[PDB]
Amino acid sequence: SMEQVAMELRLTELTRLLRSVLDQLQDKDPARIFAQPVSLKEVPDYLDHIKHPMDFATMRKRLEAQGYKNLHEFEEDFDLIIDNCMKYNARDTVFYRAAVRLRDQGGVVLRQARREVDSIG
Ligand SMILES: CC(=O)N1CCNC(=O)C1
Q1: Which CATH number applies to 1-121?
Q2: CA dist 44 → 18, 41, 89, 90, 110 (Å)
Q3: What 8-state DSSP symbol labels residue 37?
Q4: End-to-end distance of the chain based on CA atoms, in angstroms?
């Protein structure tokens, strides 16, 4: 149907916008602490602590499969990256501090993205 196509154009465009948002958020992680899944080889007990792991590479996989239906779903995963890190790692670690900085700097990007998603529809 024509409607299904129109919908898919919208989703494709959302994906385009979220790909840009994702790139802007990952720039705020120059150390690449959040680039890849936490290694279950190097942190064998990780899943005992963190029930829903997340990382930028995993987000990008879902993104390119057009698996984010709205901005809220995307934000949920970004929040997982931060929140997981701030629980597993103590306050006085480079890991925890990197998550705080990513959260704070990412807020700007996500504030504008919300306006844009609403604006474009
Ligand atoms: C993201 C995170 O929290 N990590 C990844 C590296 N290894 C760790 O122990 C902690």
Answers
A1: 1.20.920.10
A2: 32, 5, 15, 18, 33
A3: P
A4: 21
